Amino acid sequence: SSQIRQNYSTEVEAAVNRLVNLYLRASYTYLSLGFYFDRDDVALEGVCHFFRELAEEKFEGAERLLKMQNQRGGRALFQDLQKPSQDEWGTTLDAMKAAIVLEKSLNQALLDLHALGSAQADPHLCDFLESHFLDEEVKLIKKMGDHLTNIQRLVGSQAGLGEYLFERLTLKH
Amino acid sequence: SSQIRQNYSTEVEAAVNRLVNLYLRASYTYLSLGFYFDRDDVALEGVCHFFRELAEEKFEGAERLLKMQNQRGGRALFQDLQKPSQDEWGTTLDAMKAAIVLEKSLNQALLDLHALGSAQADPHLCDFLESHFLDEEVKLIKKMGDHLTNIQRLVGSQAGLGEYLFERLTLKH
Amino acid sequence: SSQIRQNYSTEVEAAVNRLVNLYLRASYTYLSLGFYFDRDDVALEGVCHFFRELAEEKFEGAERLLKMQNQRGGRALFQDLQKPSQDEWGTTLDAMKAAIVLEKSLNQALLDLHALGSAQADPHLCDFLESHFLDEEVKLIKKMGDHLTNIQRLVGSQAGLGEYLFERLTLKH
Amino acid sequence: SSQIRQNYSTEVEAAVNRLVNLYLRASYTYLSLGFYFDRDDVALEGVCHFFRELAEEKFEGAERLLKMQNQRGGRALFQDLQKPSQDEWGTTLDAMKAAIVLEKSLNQALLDLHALGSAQADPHLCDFLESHFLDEEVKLIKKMGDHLTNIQRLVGSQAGLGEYLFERLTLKH
Amino acid sequence: SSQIRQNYSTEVEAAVNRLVNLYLRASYTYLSLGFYFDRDDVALEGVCHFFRELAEEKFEGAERLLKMQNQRGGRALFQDLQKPSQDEWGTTLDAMKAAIVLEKSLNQALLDLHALGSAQADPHLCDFLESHFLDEEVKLIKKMGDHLTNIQRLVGSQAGLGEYLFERLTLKH
Ligand SMILES: CCN(CC)c1ccc2nc3c4ccccc4c(=O)cc-3oc2c1
Ligand SMILES: CCN(CC)c1ccc2nc3c4ccccc4c(=O)cc-3oc2c1
Ligand SMILES: [Cl-]
Ligand SMILES: [Cl-]
Ligand SMILES: [Cl-]
Ligand SMILES: [Cl-]
Ligand SMILES: [Cl-]
């Protein structure tokens, strides 16, 4: 409320609510990816666990945004959450490509919100994103690119063999 | 590569590579300073250890820049490393003055890169420098100024005595 | 200085300084190899760690030479450090071949310095090299040859698969 | 005796006995230096302890030579031990200069014996000296030069003050 | 000697000495196999360790036979030990086939000695072989057959890949 709100624009408040939607959508996408890889006809446990972990990380991101919204005196507003873009996610390669596309979209939304904060002279917002989101996103995208490269190297002329080996020797934990 | 690169300009990529060169040059300068103070005709162990520690710190700085370059999708490019500016470093006072000059040069390069990042709207770069370099540099320059002042107070009319006492009671560990 | 210098020729002093340059050049080469393998489009962690460890080992070698130079009363003299021979290092096989070529060059330089020491009747120098460098180099070259052979056996008709398996089952730690 | 003696020349046997004499003479010199610094009118405990420790180290050196003589089948032969060159040793500076002169003399004797062993193709003798004497001597001479330099820096225009400070802050343990 | 010898035929005594020769020959064969796999151009550590362990096991077998010979009052007689049948041992498959051939030969020699003992009514000899040799040999031959089958399954159309995988996932310890 207005009792604590200071230097917190309506534009930033709304963009924060939009970003919560994007993180919860991303969490939902990762839930769908994770359970696809748990199908008996897909059966790649390491890939399932990778994406289920990302579902939790994205929910945590939304939670942190909602805590900050209240710390600043803004009001959380929730919208409908769109279902994921696919019901079936193809190979590990297809899935990891979809995830990197998703992560770049979230990263661009973080950068856009940082730029709005900078324009509005809101350094608390800018520090919040830098401290809890920007480097986390850069680290995750780098990890996913490393994975993509290893998955791509393993396709060669024996795709099933490569897909099994990647799950067993890189992801399974 | 382009598979992960996002909001990372060619200008920042090149300046990062330049800054790696400056840190490795600084590491090399500190290696030369450290071993000069280990000469049998100089023999100031605390001063030697001070500069050898700084050689390692500057290498670590270069390492962190190289990790970040890859996290962002840029490409490390290495250049020849210039030898240090002196083969003999004079007194502890002369050496500490040279080190503060070196550190101010690195600090200015950090500030210049921060300003480029700000101009290019690259908040990850700006946060990286603020979080791992700017305050570390400020702390080190303050330490070195404190040392300079103590060394200068000890010169008086008995320079050898002062140089021994500083090494024994401030630096030796 | 002359206050401690005994049985230490100008020829050995200069060759020691040259060898410090070669070790620091080798360290720099291994830094470049290590970070190449950390690229998102290469992504072979075990190979990166192998070469980063070698960067540190070669720096340690230079450090030991510089300590001995001072123990003997010689004077360390530093020269410019040439950049590595390549900016991109190809496959793990290409890189391991380059490393063995580098190591044989360092080994020949050690042998040449040993021979100079023997000719100058400098047994301290000869023992120093035998005790801290010759067997270390032989052990490392044997390791690298073992690696080369395993990498070569894995190329067959599925190079990407072999390169992944070598990194995962031999190098990753 | 001849029952075990193999590749052990009469020349090396005699030079070993001569070297035992030199080490025991050096031990005796250090005993005299140590007790001089324990005089009530000299009273520099750290300097006394430094030289008493060196008396023990030199005796240990003689002991090791005598063990090796018997291991090789040679026969220990003892000669009269000359008294030290001085009854009073002057300042800490005078004493440290005398000690470095003594150590260089022992080092030259080690080098001469190494050269005889090399000429006689006696690698056990050569390794023995390299492993237990040459580097120990180099390390000690470097230490003594470092001390000389610090003592010399402290003389300035207040010699008593410098002599006290060196004993208290470098040697006293 | 005759002071303890009881129910111990000259035929069994001689066959025991022959069997010691066969075990020491087998130990020597396994030493050669082990070091072949340690060559830089073969480089299969698990295979090397497998055969070096077998060298020790076969020596232990000879030792046990020699202890028993003396327990029974027979006299150990040693003969020349023939060098192994090959200087180079080919692939892991070739080597494992040679080892199974060697083990079947030792097993037949054990069975022949058991039969001689049975014919001579020497139950101590028969129990000795049953208790310390027959089942050990059966277990080892079964292990080696299991290995052969796995090596053979891995040849397919990528022999190098299979040879690496067997060493890494079955033998390396
Ligand atoms: C002279 C410029 N160069 C050559 C590129 C240096 C200088 C200093 C270095 N210091 C280290 C170092 C220091 C402490 C602990 C670990 C390490 C290490 O693993 C690698 C190093 O590499 C170095 C290279
Ligand atoms: C032959 C006459 N000389 C030379 C003056 C000896 C003889 C025996 C010595 N034994 C020791 C000794 C023995 C045990 C533990 C410590 C020490 C030591 O610190 C110094 C010694 O100094 C010696 C000199
Ligand atoms: Cl939808
Ligand atoms: Cl230059
Ligand atoms: Cl160059
Ligand atoms: Cl005399
Ligand atoms: Cl034969």
Residue numbers in the entry:
A (entry chain A), B (entry chain A), C (entry chain A), D (entry chain A), E (entry chain A): 1 to 173
Sentences from the paper on this structure:
As a scaffold for aromatic cluster design, we chose ferritin as a protein cage platform with a 12 nm outer diameter and an 8 nm inner cavity, composed of 24 subunits. To prove this concept through protein engineering, we focused on a two‐fold symmetric inter‐subunit interface of a recombinant horse spleen apo‐L ferritin (Fr) as a target region for mutagenesis. Herein, we present the construction of an aromatic cluster with an artificial molecular binding pocket at the two‐fold symmetric interface of ferritin and explore its ligand‐binding characteristics. We developed a system that uses ligand binding as a driving force to induce and propagate changes in the orientation of multiple aromatic side chains.
To create the ligand‐binding pocket, we first designed a mutant Fr‐F1 (Fr‐R59F) in which Arg59 was replaced by Phe59. Analysis of the 2Fo‐Fc maps revealed electron densities corresponding to Nile Red (NR) at the two‐fold symmetric interfaces of NR•Fr‐F1, NR•Fr‐F2, NR•Fr‐F4, and NR•Fr‐F6, observed as overlapping densities due to the interface symmetry. NR was positioned between two F59 residues, forming π–π stacking interactions in an F59–NR–F59' configuration. Anion‐π interactions between NR and E60 in NR•Fr‐F1 and NR•Fr‐F2, and CH‐π interactions between NR and F60 in NR•Fr‐F6, were identified, indicating NR's stabilization in the F59–F59' pocket via multiple non‐covalent interactions. Notably, NR•Fr‐F1 and NR•Fr‐F2, containing only one and two Phe residues, respectively, achieve higher quantum yields (94 and 95%, respectively) and longer lifetimes (5.54 and 5.75 ns, respectively) than NR•Fr‐F6 with six Phe residues per monomer. The hydrophobic and polar nature of the protein surface around NR influences its fluorescence properties, with the partially polar microenvironment in Fr‐F1 and Fr‐F2, attributed to Glu residues near the pocket entrance, potentially enhancing fluorescence. The quantum yield of Nile Red (NR) significantly increased from 0.50 in 100% methanol (MeOH) and 0.38 in a 50% MeOH‐water mixture to 0.88–0.95 upon encapsulation within Fr‐F1, Fr‐F2, Fr‐F4, and Fr‐F6. Furthermore, NR's fluorescence lifetime extended from 2.87 ns in organic solvent and 1.26 ns in aqueous‐organic mixture to 5.23–5.75 ns within these ferritin variants.
